[model samples]
Every structure is written in C-alpha cells, then in structure tokens.
Target chain A: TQIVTERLVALLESGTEKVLLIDSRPFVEYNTSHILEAININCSKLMKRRLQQDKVLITELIQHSADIDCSQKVVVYDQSSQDVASLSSDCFLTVLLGKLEKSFNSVHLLAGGFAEFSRCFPGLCEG
Target chain B: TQIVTERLVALLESGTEKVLLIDSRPFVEYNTSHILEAININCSKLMKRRLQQDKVLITELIQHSAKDIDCSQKVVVYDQSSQDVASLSSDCFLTVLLGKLEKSFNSVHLLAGGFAEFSRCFPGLCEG
Candidate 1:
C-alpha cells in the first residue's frame, strides 16, 4: 500500500503513532533537505546489501540511524516515484520495499515520493 | 498556487482542457527531455529583457514559440526547482517569470518539483 502526502502529514501531526519515515534518496540530496523525522537511506546501497544477503549489515545500517521495531509503521520514499508499475522489478526502490515488507509487519510506499511530499509540506521538512 | 505532479498528470490525461505548459530551464536541459506540449523559455534572457522593461521583446519571445496567448487559460511553468519555495531568491528565474506571467494571465502556476519530479513520475509522457 502507498501513503499520500495528506495522510503522512496527519501521521506526523497526530503524534499518537511512531512512524519510521525513511528517505531513500542519495546521501547528497538527503544532506540538502528531507522530510522531518525521516532517516536517510541509500536505496542503491541497501539493495546491494540485500542482494548480497547481508541481513545483519542491513539491520545495523537502519538501526544505526533509527530504531527497528516490527510493530512500528515503516514508510519509505525515493526522489519521485509515483507507482511500482513505473519502475522495474530490480530497481533500487523496489528492492528496498521488498526487503522492508519482510521485516516490518506494516511497510508502505510513500506515494509521489519525497519530491511531492516536500513540495506539499515544506514546513514539515528540514535540512 | 503550485502544481503537483499528480494534478499535472490529471490535467494532461483529461484532454478535456488546453494547458499551456512552459519549461523555464536552460535550452540544453529542455532539449534533453521535457513534458509533452511544453514550450521552452530562456529564463535568463527573459529576466534581462524584463529588467530593461522590454515588453515587446518579451512578447515576441513567447509569441515566436507559442501561438495565440490566452491569458484566460491556465499557464504552468517549471524549472529544476527542488528546494523550498520560501528559500528561493527574489531574483530567481522562476520568481521573475512568475511576476511577469501574473501581469498578463489570470491563472499561473509553478510546477512543484519541476522537470525532475515530473519526469520521474511519468517518463513515458515526456519527449526530447
């Protein structure tokens, strides 16, 4: 399932749930700016680790920046992905999504990705 | 108001209304790939002319590329603007163009993520 900008804003505003917002863009872009409360993750690097079956390293990488709780809702986004159909199966975002779903009970893709989200809610973003 | 990729897609997909899409990036980037039906505009030159108050040249520039300018219809412009709108400089190309466009058009909008986002969302809908 995909989460929209409006719903993501609501989730952040509610403060009732612990949402793990993960930004899947390059580190350079992430360094410039990203959504508030989002932990930057390199999709390509993560995908490479997953392909190598380095689950422990993947766990370490994510846990290094954010807590890993199966109960928490995980939302991952790239630069500007609209849907899975538009992407190839081996695409970094696709691979990351697949890996996330297996670990977390509820993993959702952010519809329209970071570009759309930041554009819609600039106030909710930080460098 | 600004235009998001989703809404922009809806407008293009509808085919019910005519939209005047303008690309405000450099000619090289515009030549590489841009949204279908979007005309390219040299923001730097336009700004230069605007600074000199050359209305005729500005009019000629737009009219040369696009036919029949209708201020009533929607006109949307975009560049490679990825940062927050609040952070953009006052003299930025998009900002300057917005000021110029508002004078003649009733409704003018900027593409939220510009070419980068639009292309990412709908690569098939673009042409070089």
Candidate 2:
C-alpha cells in the first residue's frame, strides 16, 4: 500500500522525486516560505462545503492530482502550532483529510507540519 | 457607580463624549474597525497575568482609568463571533473580567454578550 511506501522522514527527504507536498495555508503564507514541491490549497471557505459533499471533493482532489501521477504519494502540510492562521487552516484540513481518506488512498499528513519540517531540515528550509 | 453609569448601549451611543471603549481583540482586528471611544488592550496576554494576581491588576486597571474621570466607565469589546482569534481572546478576557470582579467591586456581566447587547441588559447575571 502507499501508506507503507512513504513514511514521514523518508517522504521529506525524498523531496520532489517521490512525494507531492500540498500546503493548505493561504496564498500569502505559502509565498512567505513553503516546501519546493508544496501546492497551495486554501481550504477555509471550501471546508464547510467540502464536508457536506465529501465524496465529490475527495474524488476531484484525487483526480486532479492524478494528472501528476496517481501512483505517487501525496502529503498535506499546514502552518500550525503557535500560528493562529496556521492552526485554523490546519484544523479544517485535518477534518477534510480524514474525510478524503474514507474514499481515496495514498494521502498522509506531514508530521509536526511545516514548522517541524523547517526545524528538522534546517539546511533545506533556510531562507 | 461606574457599573450603573456604563450600561451597554448608552455606552455605545455616548461616543467619544463619555465612554472609553477598549477593544480586547488583536491590534490588527482593532485597526480594521472599532468604536471611536474604544482603545485596544489585547487583554489575551495581560489577562492571564492579571488573573494570577487579580487584586493587584484590578487595582492597577481601575487606578489607571481613574485618571480619565472615575465617573466615566470602561467598556471592553472583542471580535469573537465566528472569528476564531476573537472567540479565543474574548474567552480569556471574560475569565479575567470575572476573576477581577470576584475580587473587586460590584461587577456585572451581560448574558450572551455582544450579539445580545442591543436586545436586553440584565442587572444581575448570576443565577441561584
């Protein structure tokens, strides 16, 4: 399964080769500093709508990402911890991702999020 | 005296004439839009510290405002309706305000807060 194929650090280290990092933060925040492979998807406004229609959104997100390579694993990250915006956005994403998992496969959350990524991969993340 | 003087809407309409509205929300929120008479206190951080030493902080806040004219009153507002930051910050402020009142003078709390501010004002918020 895709879950066994990519675990936390292995996914981060793999960079653009095996994983696609999707950032769920706003456009402004994503511009500040985001992983090279991360794609921005501001899910705040869409969250309530998405929850109401989980199957459709999940199928669409999967189909959209399938253009890149359906086989490749996808990791979602959000700015959280002490950042209020990050916390709010991440909370919505967590709920959406859980819903997505029910219908699709190969989706995982980036452990500790972007802040943790920067902490662990200091050299790669330095501006 | 101050509690009776600053009763919600009367406080809102008096404008810059008699009331000092303190926006307990973040600076960004305060800058966006706030009552003219209100000042920003960002009570979230100060609230915790204030509650830890309730007696001292209440005395200080009352003393500091005492300079402006004790007869005039202070009205605290926050942006907590569906706004997460406002919601979280206001929760902290409510707790701090309650702690201060529990220690200080005759303080009253409005039921249901701002959304209900216009509808009614209850004299005693406590229920037996």
lDDT string for model 2 (A1-127, tens) is 1222126556666565476556665343455456665666644445435654553555466445334455567777654222222222223454556655565456666644555565555455422
Question: Cα deviation in Å at residue B113, candidate 1?
Answer: 14
Cα lDDT, model 2, residue B84: 24
Enumerate residue pairs that collide in model 1.
none
Q: How accurate locally, in lDDT, is each candidate?
A: 0.68, 0.44
State the TM-score of candidate 2 restricted to chain B.
0.46
Model 2 whole-model lDDT (C-alpha atoms): 0.44
Per residue, candidate 2 scores C-alpha lDDT tens digits across B26-79 of 333333334443444433444445555553555466446432523224434332
Top candidate, metric TM-score: 1
User: Residue B5 in model 2: shift from native, Å?
Assistant: 35
Candidate 1 chain B lDDT trough over 10 residues, lowest sum:
B82-91
lDDT of 1 by residue, A9-60 (tens): 9888997888998886645446556889788775444445553464545456
State each candidate's chain A TM-score.
0.87, 0.59
Q: Every model's DockQ, to 2 decimals?
A: 0.03, 0.04
RMSD of 2: 14.1
Residue-level error in angstroms, candidate 1, position A3: 0.6
**Candidate 1 residue-wise lDDT at A74:** 81
